[PDB]
Design a protein around this ligand. Sequence first.
Ligand SMILES: [K+]
Ligand SMILES: [K+]
Ligand SMILES: [K+]
Ligand SMILES: [K+]
Ligand SMILES: [K+]
Ligand SMILES: [Mg+2]
Ligand SMILES: [Mg+2]
Ligand SMILES: [Mg+2]
Ligand SMILES: [Mg+2]
Ligand SMILES: [Mg+2]
Ligand SMILES: [Mg+2]
Ligand SMILES: [Mg+2]
Ligand SMILES: [Mg+2]
Ligand SMILES: [Mg+2]
Ligand SMILES: [Mg+2]
Ligand SMILES: [Mg+2]
Ligand SMILES: [Mg+2]
Ligand SMILES: [Mg+2]
Ligand SMILES: [Mg+2]
Ligand SMILES: [Mg+2]
Ligand SMILES: [Mg+2]
Ligand SMILES: [Mg+2]
Ligand SMILES: [Mg+2]
Ligand SMILES: [Mg+2]
Ligand SMILES: [Mg+2]
Ligand SMILES: [Mg+2]
Lengths: 353, 76, 46, 47, 108, 37, 95
Amino acid sequence: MDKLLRRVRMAEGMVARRAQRKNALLKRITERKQNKKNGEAFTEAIQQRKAAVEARNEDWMLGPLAPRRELDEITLSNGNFFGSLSPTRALLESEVSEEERKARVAWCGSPKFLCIAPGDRVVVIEGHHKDLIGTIEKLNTRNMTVEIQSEKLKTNTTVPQFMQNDADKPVTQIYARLPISSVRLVHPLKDPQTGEYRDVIIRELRPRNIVHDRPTRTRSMRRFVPGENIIIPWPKQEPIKREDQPADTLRIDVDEKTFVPTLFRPPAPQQVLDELRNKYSIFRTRHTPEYIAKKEQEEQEKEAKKSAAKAMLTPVQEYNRKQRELRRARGQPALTEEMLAKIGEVVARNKLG
Amino acid sequence: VNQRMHEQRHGDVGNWRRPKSQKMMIAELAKPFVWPKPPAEDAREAFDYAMWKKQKTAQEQDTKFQGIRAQGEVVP
Amino acid sequence: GPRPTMSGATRLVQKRRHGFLSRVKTKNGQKTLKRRLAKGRLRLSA
Amino acid sequence: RNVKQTMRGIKHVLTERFYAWEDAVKLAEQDPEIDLSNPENPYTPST
Amino acid sequence: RGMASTKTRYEVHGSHKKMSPQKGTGNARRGTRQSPLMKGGGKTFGPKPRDFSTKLNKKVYDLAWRTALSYRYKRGELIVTEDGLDLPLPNDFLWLAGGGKLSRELED
Amino acid sequence: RQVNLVLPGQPTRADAPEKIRDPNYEPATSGAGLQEI
Amino acid sequence: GLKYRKLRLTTKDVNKGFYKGNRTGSMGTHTSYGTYKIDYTKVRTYVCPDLTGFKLTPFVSKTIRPVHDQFPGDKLGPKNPATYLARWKSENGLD
RNA sequence: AUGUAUUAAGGAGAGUAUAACUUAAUUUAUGUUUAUGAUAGAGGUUAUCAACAUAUGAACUCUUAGAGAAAUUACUUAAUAAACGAAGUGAAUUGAAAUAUCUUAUUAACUUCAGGAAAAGAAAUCAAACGAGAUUCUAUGAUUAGUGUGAACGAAAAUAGAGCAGCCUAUUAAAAUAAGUAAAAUGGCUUUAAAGCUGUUUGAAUAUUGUGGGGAACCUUCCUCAAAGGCUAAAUAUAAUACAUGAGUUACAGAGAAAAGUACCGUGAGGGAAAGCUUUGAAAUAGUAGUUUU
Ligand SMILES: [K+]
Ligand SMILES: [K+]
Ligand SMILES: [K+]
Ligand SMILES: [K+]
Ligand SMILES: [K+]
Ligand SMILES: [Mg+2]
Ligand SMILES: [Mg+2]
Ligand SMILES: [Mg+2]
Ligand SMILES: [Mg+2]
Ligand SMILES: [Mg+2]
Ligand SMILES: [Mg+2]
Ligand SMILES: [Mg+2]
Ligand SMILES: [Mg+2]
Ligand SMILES: [Mg+2]
Ligand SMILES: [Mg+2]
Ligand SMILES: [Mg+2]
Ligand SMILES: [Mg+2]
Ligand SMILES: [Mg+2]
Ligand SMILES: [Mg+2]
Ligand SMILES: [Mg+2]
Ligand SMILES: [Mg+2]
Ligand SMILES: [Mg+2]
Ligand SMILES: [Mg+2]
Ligand SMILES: [Mg+2]
Ligand SMILES: [Mg+2]
Ligand SMILES: [Mg+2]
């Protein structure tokens, strides 16, 4: 029925309008909680920048009386030792906004078409350890941070005591991670003039020859250097090792085909259909003929109730209506070409002469 | 039926609601069934109990301090 | 001054006076509901 | 979560078969190669 | 644009009940909560959406147009040319840009 | 027709670092002095 | 009474004839002297099949990659009543 | 805030992969283009490394069968807020420097009825001796004509703009052209005394071959229209959504609400918050240090 569809369409809109008001309110609460969690990483960096503004003025003034700040107690504001970062600030695990991930990856594709992979050497272009070269070990695609296992990027970090034994030293040196924007790709190219291979820094990458596979939900693309069109091969990545566990079904059983369609008996007991869907849901679109027949007779019982006063009409009321039907069948007369030609003469005679 | 504490939609903010109560049933078996005894704390290494304990004590001490602050007090 | 006018109060009289069914089922109670509903109230009654 | 995805898939294929069979019956009523009246031999391969 | 707007004490949300009794509390007698003297009260003479445009005689507006056109004429800053005043961009670039060989980044 | 503007040529495949067998080649340890492209 | 009075009333709060169920279903009818007669036509049973020898488990090995179905060129690929009736003829003609 | 476009029933309870929303709470397929896009790898939870378009599975309880202390009982393929619109009833604060007529005011409010709009509508209309040609919305006409002791109240013709549409054979099915009607007396309403609405008592005529209405007391000539039967989109009202613009706000501002009709207060109707960020750190206030006085 056409009136039963409006009922469903109206229900689908009422629920989607309520899911948006709830989702919006949750997007604002989750955002307000992360911003307050990231702010603790911004505060530690702000407190250490000012601590360095005062530590340098004392080394200048005191001279031979310079304190031994490495033997001091922790800072109760953040709980860090001297000259040590915090795990949240040394691993760069603080979530970043979506407009940041696109900025960090702006130089190498996009957050969903990233053109750098683990296993390819990069060069640092920011921070204290500029112009350093190392190989990418990990690639955190959530914060768009990269780990380079170089001994120069190590940094003291304070280990929280809830994950540390009582004999373990409180501070340890871990490999610090960098954002994707702070590193560029290094790949050896061939000198077209002399044919000698030398290393160069790739300033920009973009995806090429993208092709998706819908059945498998996979894709395969190529990365090239814009301006010069140098297709750079991907680095050797080892696929994850997939194994067969004892709890998993054997390959011979998962492939067995046992379904045989039927036409005179349902695929399953007819009672099961009441469990798969709700018989009385306002979102039901597949109705039975007996139901639609009962729904269409609600209007048929109104057109017969609106026109129920046609049995109380007087003879003159019935005569008028009966004539009206006959007249509407005559139609409108038409003007023949002969009549049109005679009208054109009148127009031309009264306009031009 | 076991009732659940009334709470606020967002922990410390929101309207006051009440979660769905819990139903427990005790069946009188015709054949006895006896549970095994829990493993000794020193024999729970398969579940990483050592690390789990350190983390549990940390949260226990942060929940206790946040209760000392709820009384309007601080640790000298 | 104010008096302890809610001492000995029962929650059965609270549902019979300011309950939801006391309002949907009366012409004057349907107005209170729509007003609180149009204002945004979560607690339309009781 | 993985056990709940198999339980959801079972309910999707069963709902798909009920509706597919409920339509094949209608589509099989207007077919000249199927005689739903007699169940003993309701199909005859067309020549 | 002139669309700035502000709420007066007659537009601010809330009830128009009297805040504190006329006398008895000892504090300054207060009326409604939307008074400018209250925290969230309305701005009395605040901005409102209105029309800022003024009028200028067509003759005075035309004299000002030919006076700015003569101020440039006497200083030599009015350089009239022939019709078809377009930048004579090279033909090669126009042939490549129209063809579509050149990307936007290079075309711009 | 030939033009006076040089446009990027057709793409070329750069040899992977493992496949390079040139004896007179050594990876760069420091990024200073390397050409940026 | 200030605040608890405003929460939703439950059966664990009042006792003066206030009853409220948990939607457990009607399993019978009430008698005139306060008893209950269980109508076993309304009582529900659970049909659990024999699981001895069943080889399928709720997991599939991760070696076998997840693949969907193509149904090329057929908008209503998996729901096409024609590919369900035509497929029926070849495989099972009798039933 | 305004404008444009589109749309025409809203809320709550509980549960759930805490960007993902309904006990299936991250369903399943199509087509196209994929860096010359659009605006020759790794990766199924170490996931959703793909957008657009079109389909598609599922979508609980209450409001909302009956009863009841809404979210329960008991049954079942039971189901529609507010504002806006028309009619009925109809104040008071206020002004007149008091106050009765008057003004506030065909107002607020309530009541019924109806729709995405409603109402109104193709002249028993206005004009003035020339003519205009339905209704609705905006401005001018107009602190005007006029009314009223006064205070104040207040048209129409016409003009311009937005829209434009005419008909009864109504593009949805209606008239055999309208009688207890027009009108009169009387009591009220509206109002300028006309026209219009109305309770009570009474009560006409039949077309320009000059019958009937109107043209602001009233009569007459002339002009003009044709009541007592009907249909009709648009421009207009409100709400929601999206977008555009800004000598709009930038956190005691903007809105009541940057997590809000929430916390909280009230038996209840009802009243109704505070709270941004990692930046800067004023004044008051407090404890000390240096110089100085006591
Ligand atoms: K007077
Ligand atoms: K006057
Ligand atoms: K009159
Ligand atoms: K505010
Ligand atoms: K200060
Ligand atoms: Mg691949
Ligand atoms: Mg279900
Ligand atoms: Mg459905
Ligand atoms: Mg008293
Ligand atoms: Mg008492
Ligand atoms: Mg008042
Ligand atoms: Mg304000
Ligand atoms: Mg000016
Ligand atoms: Mg109790
Ligand atoms: Mg008790
Ligand atoms: Mg009872
Ligand atoms: Mg009911
Ligand atoms: Mg019900
Ligand atoms: Mg006017
Ligand atoms: Mg007539
Ligand atoms: Mg009359
Ligand atoms: Mg007269
Ligand atoms: Mg008359
Ligand atoms: Mg007529
Ligand atoms: Mg301003
Ligand atoms: Mg301020």
